[PDB]
């Protein structure tokens, strides 16, 4: 009749032309650019197929033991499988650790941990945004509470030294005695080094606070064994299932379960599960949990372990190649997948550079460097190797890359001379758009990057 | 070269055999059962293909105007398209309404509004859980603050008349005068009737509170024009993009923008507060594939085919009501203005607890709910039945008459085990007797073998074999 209603069978490319091209376009913008954004990566066809399944269609509100609905014989099979793969892939005795796989992304998971362990107005210490922390580790101004984490809990930042780039731990341990936090966060969004979880545990225990690691950026490296495991000192560990773990967007919270002390058990499990549900979320996204389960399988495999070993080495290559060209790397080096490039040695800033490199189809982002005084004119560049390593690039290809980046910095500087010394940014950006002189080089530099990029592959479903 | 590690091109059926079967099993459990859970539905292949795309791979932190990263020409094209489809599908002048499209789901969308407009410890009022409200509308008891809504904010509930099953608006107006809510919630999870948004606006205004509608359950019906629009009285309206809108799991927040009232003249400020609460306040990077699906689902929602499916959904409900009323069941408000009904199983001598399980075992899905009059949330007397999911598989009035009949058989059966169980018997007992007795297991198998035969006669929306 009008029961043409089986438009439900109709495929996207025919149902929504507008959305189809957008996908076809983006997936192409990916194939030709160089992704150096540390938090980016490319999920496998496998993980990606799970997201489109009919598991979207099931409401499984509660947990595998206790659910609020019924046709859940399979969603329980699934969620359990995922919890088991998670604890396995990080090699955790389930008689010591548990895992919640329901958080929707990194952020919710973090939050849910605060709700659970810290309470409304309890204190949190996180590394400052400019010194390398995340928005969810608290973030204020003398005027406003930006991040929900500073709106509902009382937060305080601990900073890195402004000459080493290193977290000043003697400071943290001194202020924590004065601030009295209920939880210390150990995790970063832009830090080249391994965190001393051992010392942090000391500081936490001396205050009767929980040590929480947010290993979102290094989760992949930790599965492989490349960087040291946080699990040895922390009571809780949250993580995205997608930055270097290379899954789809989701989050997990790992918590300790078992014994704790003199003459007493952990209670972490029930508090954290409750906070995620019914505390904060609604029905779990089962297709998401599927992809996470898939990605955890692939992560245990030795092919992942090699990709993760490649990732770090690709970073040492890129560092050296740039060091050799006169660039300063912030802590002098890196223990993992990223580097903080200080562009003050080349006479420019990360604000300007970021834009010129962007126009050349090279992606990265600006970041403040330890010493900076003005988050308005940031001096750094955050470069990471995960996404490009997933497309195959081995060291020699990254030397190729270091060179393109260099050209781009040279380019940004030409525009910084030809712009004037008291030049606003709206200007610099204007001149990069209108001046034909410049457009020529930019266009040339780009035509050169995309072709280099098209050589390696782009993971994903049929073409996209 | 271990660099043959391109296990990244390798398909699921080959890469994860364990998860493949789990998907193949569930998608099958779906084809043979009768889904009567009101919040469930089946998304189209179209909406479902968008979820698997490369859009997953992009980080687009900020908003279309100001993002924090760069390769976003397309994500902006997309997010805008979605915002436009949304305002369009509900027929809203974009000079009067804006839409945030990044909530990861209904729950977080509500939380963001409360975070933006009510602030920490600000007062909120919503319908009580057992009276048909939703968890996120606040939920607390004598000992614990259970929902996060009632942890960070201070909530107090309003209830339905227990002799009528209708919201008692008189009490809500009285109580609001003493409680001073900063925001009143107008939305339900299990309510057969239209909410008088008009009167709720008059109570909100009298108190200088915001009227927020959470139309999650009825969003589909509202796009078709079946039930009346909340948009005519509320300052903000949140909704899932998946209950009766039939999309993927995500959420949206609609807010007023323009001039709110004059002395000069003061504008709404709703937009910037809301947007900021969503980001960078609460969430991280948007899920672009999810947004793609929502955009797809909204285009399908404007089409007259959706409008006909939505008109069918309501009628299928009237069919299911009557068929059941005719068998002696008491429908809670006596009827329904939408997609669901709250069945009172006290007239058949049993409860929602036991029934739910028997019907479950017979491949018939629904869930228990307290009825207005109930005193014991462990002994709920009701059944929430909804028509959306089965209407998406084609069932018409007449098919629902046979459904009504299967449900009936199942209640008769639950009663057989309740009698053959003893009166002072426990749910652990009832559930175990339903499992060990072959006497019972026979009927159950027979009734099940019969439901599946019936369900298989209908299509099941979804992408290929998965
Ligand atoms: C289900 C529902 C929600 C919550 O959505 P989730 O996607 O489960 O987080 C919010 N409001 C109402 C009215 C609902 O029925
Ligand atoms: C990116 C990131 C997150 C947040 O993940 P979203 O999905 O973007 O919410 C959390 N923690 C750290 C340390 C991160 O880098």
Which of B43, B104, B296 lies closest to A104 in CB terms?
B104
Name residues whose C-beta falls within 8 Å of residue A201's C-beta, 6 or more positions apart in sequence: A211, A233, A234
| Token pair in block for residue A149 | 């984490």
Contact predicate A212/A236, CB 8 Å: yes
Contact predicate A460/B54, CB 8 Å: yes
Contact predicate B294/B247, CB 8 Å: yes
| Token pair in block for residue B304 | 């007259």
Q: Report the alpha-carbon distance of residue B343 to residue B335 in Å, rounded.
A: 10
Q: Which domain holds residue B112?
A: 41-311
A417, A418, A424, A430 alpha-carbon torsion, rounded to 10°? -140
Name the nearest CA neighbour of A359 among A418, A250, A267, A441: A441
Give Cα separations from B396 to A64, B44, B141, B300, B305 (angstroms).
Answer: 35, 19, 42, 21, 15
Name the nearest CA neighbour of B44 among A288, A4, A54, A9: A9
Contact predicate B105/A285, CB 8 Å: yes
Chain A 389-408, residues with CB within 8 Å of chain B CB atoms: 390, 392, 394
Q: Report the alpha-carbon distance of residue B348 to residue B330 in Å, rounded.
A: 9
Contact predicate A238/A113, CB 8 Å: yes
Strand, coil or helix: what is B244?
Answer: coil
- B161 and B123 belong to one structural domain: yes
Interface residue B49 vs chain A (CB under 8 A): yes
Ligand 2 centre to CA of A239 (Å) is 8
| Token pair in block for residue A456 | 């390696």
Q: Is B49 among the domain residues?
A: yes
Q: Report the alpha-carbon distance of residue A261 to residue A323 in Å, rounded.
A: 49
- B157 and B217 belong to one structural domain: yes
Residue A28: other Cβ atoms inside 10 A: 15
Q: Which strands, in side-by-side order, build the sheet including B251-256?
A: B97-100, B251-256, B236-240, B210-214, B183-186, B123-127, B154-158
Q: Report the alpha-carbon distance of residue B304 to residue B225 in Å, rounded.
A: 11
- B236 and B92 belong to one structural domain: yes
Ligand nearest to the CA of B247: 1
Convert chain A into a string of H (helix), E (strand) and C (coil).
CCCCCCCCCCCHHHHCHHHHHHHHHHHHHHHHCEECCCCCCCCCHHHHHHCCCHHHHCCCCCCCCCCCCCCCCCHHHHHHHHHHHHHHHCCCCCCCEEEECCCCCHHHHHHHHHHHHCCCCCEEEEECCCCCCCHHHCCECCCCECCHHHHCCEEEEECECCCCCCECHHHHHHHHHHHCCCEEEECCCCCCCCCCHHHHHHHHHHHCCEEEEECCCCHHHHHHCCCCCHHHCCCEEEEECCCCCCCCCCEEEEEECCECCCCCECCHHHHHHHHHHHHHCCCCCHHHHHHHHHHHHHHHCHHHHHHHHHHHHHHHHHHHHHHCCCCEECCCCCCCCEEEEEHHHHCCCHHHHHHHHHHCCEECEEECCCCCCCCCCCCEEEEECHHHHCCCCCHHHHHHHHHHHHHHHHHHHHHHHCCCCCCCHHHHHHHHHHCHHHHHHHHHHHHHHHHHHHHCCCCCCCCC
Q: Is B11 among the domain residues?
A: no
CA distance B356 to chain A (A): 8
DSSP state of B363: T
Residue B442: other Cβ atoms inside 10 A: 10
- A56 and A20 belong to one structural domain: no
Q: Report the alpha-carbon distance of residue B138 to residue A150 in Å, rounded.
A: 22
B258: left (phi over 0), alpha (psi -120 to 50) or beta: left
- A20 and A161 belong to one structural domain: no
Residue ending a domain, among B280, B311, B342, is B311
Pocket residue to mutate for ligand 2, from A131, A189, A291, A367, most atoms within 8 A of Cβ: A189
Element (H, E) at B275: helix B270-276
Residues of B within 8 A of A81 (CB-CB) are 18-19, 22
Cross-strand pairs, B413 = none
Pocket residue to mutate for ligand 1, from B136, B222, B246, most atoms within 8 A of Cβ: B136
Contact predicate B159/B213, CB 8 Å: no
Name residues whose C-beta falls within 8 Å of residue B255's C-beta, 6 or more positions apart in sequence: B97, B98, B99, B100, B235, B236, B268, B270, B271, B274
Contact predicate A409/A358, CB 8 Å: no
Residue ending a domain, among A273, A289, A309, is A309
Q: Report the alpha-carbon distance of residue A279 to residue A24 in Å, rounded.
A: 39
| Token pair in block for residue B16 | 């994860």
- A326 and A237 belong to one structural domain: no
The approach used to solve this structure was X-ray
Q: Is A3 among the domain residues?
A: no
Contact predicate B234/B97, CB 8 Å: no
Strands (E), B141-201: 154-158, 183-186
Convert A58-99 into a string of H (helix), E (strand) and C (coil).
CCCCCCCCCCCCCCCCCHHHHHHHHHHHHHHHCCCCCCCEEE
Residue B379: other Cβ atoms inside 10 A: 14
Phi, psi of B225 (to 5 degrees): 95, 10
Convert B313-339 into a string of H (helix), E (strand) and C (coil).
HHHHHHHHHHHHHCCCCEECCCCCCCC
Q: Report the alpha-carbon distance of residue B81 to residue A372 in Å, rounded.
A: 39
Q: Is A179 among the domain residues?
A: yes
- B271 and B403 belong to one structural domain: no
Strand, coil or helix: what is B90?
Answer: coil
Looking up residue B186, the CATH number of its domain turns out to be 3.40.640.10
**CA B429, B431, B436, B441 torsion-angle sign:** positive
Name residues whose C-beta falls within 8 Å of residue A196's C-beta, 6 or more positions apart in sequence: A167, A169
Q: Is A6 among the domain residues?
A: no
Contact predicate A297/A50, CB 8 Å: no
Pocket residue to mutate for ligand 1, from B39, B216, B230, most atoms within 8 A of Cβ: B216
Contact predicate B251/B141, CB 8 Å: no
Ligand 1 centre to CA of A58 (Å) is 13
Q: Report the alpha-carbon distance of residue B340 to residue B217 in Å, rounded.
A: 9
Cα Rg of chain A (Å, integer): 23
Ligand nearest to the CA of B110: 1
Scanning the structure block, which residue is given the tokens 């089986």? A6
Give Cα separations from B68 to A110, A359, B218, B403 (angstroms).
Answer: 21, 15, 35, 53
- B139 and B279 belong to one structural domain: yes
Which of B10, B240, B282 lies closest to A45 in CB terms?
B10
Query: Percentage helix, strand, coil, to 5, in chain B?
Result: 45, 15, 40
Q: Is A163 among the domain residues?
A: yes
Interface residue A122 vs chain B (CB under 8 A): no
Residues across chain B = 466
- A370 and A268 belong to one structural domain: no
- A209 and A116 belong to one structural domain: yes
Q: Report the alpha-carbon distance of residue A50 to residue B23 in Å, rounded.
A: 8
- A386 and A334 belong to one structural domain: yes
Strands B210-214 and A380-384: unpaired
> Is residue B408 classed exposed, middle or buried when 0-12, 13-18 and 19+ CB atoms within 10 A define those classes?
middle
| Token pair in block for residue A458 | 């782009």
Looking up residue A409, the CATH number of its domain turns out to be 3.90.1150.10
Name the nearest CA neighbour of B320 among B401, B408, B394: B401
Q: Report the alpha-carbon distance of residue B291 to residue B120 in Å, rounded.
A: 29
Cross-strand pairs, B145 = B140
B253 lines ligand 1 (CB under 6 A): no
Interface residue A58 vs chain B (CB under 8 A): yes
Q: Report the alpha-carbon distance of residue A43 to residue A387 in Å, rounded.
A: 10
Contact predicate B97/B87, CB 8 Å: yes
Strands B34-35 and B364-365: parallel
Ligand 2 centre to CA of A106 (Å) is 4
Resolution, expressed in angstroms to one decimal:
2.8
| Token pair in block for residue A183 | 């939880």
Q: Report the alpha-carbon distance of residue A102 to residue B337 in Å, rounded.
A: 34
Residue A249: other Cβ atoms inside 10 A: 28
Q: Report the alpha-carbon distance of residue A258 to residue A97 in Å, rounded.
A: 8
List residues in chain B that are followed by a break over 2.5 Å (C to N).
263
Q: Report the alpha-carbon distance of residue B341 to residue B49 in Å, rounded.
A: 33
Q: Report the alpha-carbon distance of residue A4 to residue A237 in Å, rounded.
A: 50
Name residues whose C-beta falls within 8 Å of residue B307's C-beta, 6 or more positions apart in sequence: B223, B224, B225
Q: Report the alpha-carbon distance of residue B242 to residue A447 in Å, rounded.
A: 43
Q: Report the alpha-carbon distance of residue B193 to residue B160 in Å, rounded.
A: 11
Q: Is A345 among the domain residues?
A: yes
Contact predicate A122/A277, CB 8 Å: no
Which of B54, B68, B365 lies closest to A23 in CB terms?
B54
Is the CB of A294 less than 8 angstroms away from the CB of B49? no
Tally of domains within chain B = 2
- A218 and A332 belong to one structural domain: no
C-beta contacts of B367-371 below 8 A and 24+ residues apart:
B367/A68, B367/A69, B367/A70, B367/B37, B369/B130, B369/B132, B369/B190, B369/B342, B370/B130, B370/B131, B371/B165, B371/B332, B371/B342, B371/B344, B371/B346
Which of A19, A56, A293 lies closest to B292 in CB terms?
A19
Phi, psi of B211 (to 5 degrees): -100, 115
Q: Is B374 among the domain residues?
A: yes
Contact predicate A108/A280, CB 8 Å: yes
Contact predicate A251/A240, CB 8 Å: yes
Residue ending a domain, among A309, A337, A352, is A309
> Is residue B359 classed exposed, middle or buried when 0-12, 13-18 and 19+ CB atoms within 10 A define those classes?
buried
Phi, psi of A67 (to 5 degrees): -110, 160
**CA B406, B407, B412, B415 torsion-angle sign:** positive
Name the nearest CA neighbour of A276 among A120, A124, A113: A113
Q: Rounded to the nearest 5 degrees, what angle is found at the Cα of B336, between the Cα atoms of B29 and B324? A: 60
Q: Report the alpha-carbon distance of residue B155 to residue B126 in Å, rounded.
A: 8
* Catalytic residue list contains B190: yes
Q: Report the alpha-carbon distance of residue A6 to residue B305 in Å, rounded.
A: 9
- Residue A306, Cα to own-chain centre: how many angstroms? 20
């Amino acid at each position: 009749w009008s029961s043409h209603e089986q438009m439900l069978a109709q495929p996207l490319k025919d149902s929504d032309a507008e959305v189809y091209d957008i996908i076809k376009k983006e997936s192409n913008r990916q194939r030709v650019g160089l992704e150096l954004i540390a938090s980016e990566n490319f999920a496998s066809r496998a993980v990606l197929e799970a997201l489109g399944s009919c598991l979207n269609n099931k409401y499984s509100e509660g947990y595998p033991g206790q659910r609020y609905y019924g046709g859940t014989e399979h969603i329980d099979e699934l969620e359990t499988l995922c919890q088991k793969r998670a604890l396995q892939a990080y090699g955790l005795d389930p008689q010591c650790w548990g895992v919640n796989v329901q958080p929707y992304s990194g952020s919710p998971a973090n939050f849910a941990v605060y709700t659970a362990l810290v309470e409304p107005h309890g204190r949190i210490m996180g590394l400052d945004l400019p010194d390398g922390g995340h928005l969810t580790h608290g973030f204020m101004t003398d005027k406003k509470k930006i991040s929900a984490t500073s709106i509902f809990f009382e937060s305080m930042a601990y900073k890195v030294n402004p000459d080493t780039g290193y977290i000043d731990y003697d400071r943290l341990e001194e202020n924590a005695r004065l601030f009295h936090p209920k939880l210390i966060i150990a995790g970063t969004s832009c830090y080249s080094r391994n965190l001393d979880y051992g010392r942090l545990r000391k500081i936490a225990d001396e205050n009767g606070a929980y040590l929480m690691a947010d290993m979102a950026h290094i989760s992949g490296l930790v599965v492989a064994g490349v960087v040291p495991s946080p699990f040895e000192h922390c009571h809780v560990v949250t993580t995205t299932t997608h930055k270097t773990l290379r899954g789809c967007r989701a989050g997990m919270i790992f918590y300790r379960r078992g014994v704790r002390s003199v003459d007493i058990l952990y209670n972490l499990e029930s508090l954290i599960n409750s906070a995620v549900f019914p505390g904060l979320q609604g029905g779990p996204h089962n297709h998401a949990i599927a992809g996470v389960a898939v990605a955890l399988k692939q992560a245990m495999t030795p092919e992942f372990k090699e990709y993760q070993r490649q990732v770090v080495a690709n970073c040492r290559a890129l560092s050296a190649a740039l060091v050799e060209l006169g660039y300063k790397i912030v802590t002098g080096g890196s223990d993992n997948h990223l580097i903080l490039v200080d562009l003050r040695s080349k006479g420019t800033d990360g604000g300007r550079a970021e834009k010129v490199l962007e126009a050349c189809s090279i992606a990265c982002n600006k970041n403040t460097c330890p010493g900076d005084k003005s988050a308005l004119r940031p001096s750094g560049l955050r470069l990471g190797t995960p996404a490009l390593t997933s497309r195959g690039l081995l060291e020699k290809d990254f030397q190729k890359v270091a060179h393109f980046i260099h050209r781009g910095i040279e380019l940004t500087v030409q525009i910084q001379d030809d712009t004037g010394p008291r030049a606003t940014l709206k200007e610099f950006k204007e001149k990069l758009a209108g001046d034909e002189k410049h457009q020529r080089a930019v266009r040339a530099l780009r035509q050169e990057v995309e072709s280099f990029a098209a050589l390696f592959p782009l993971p994903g479903l049929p073409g996209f």
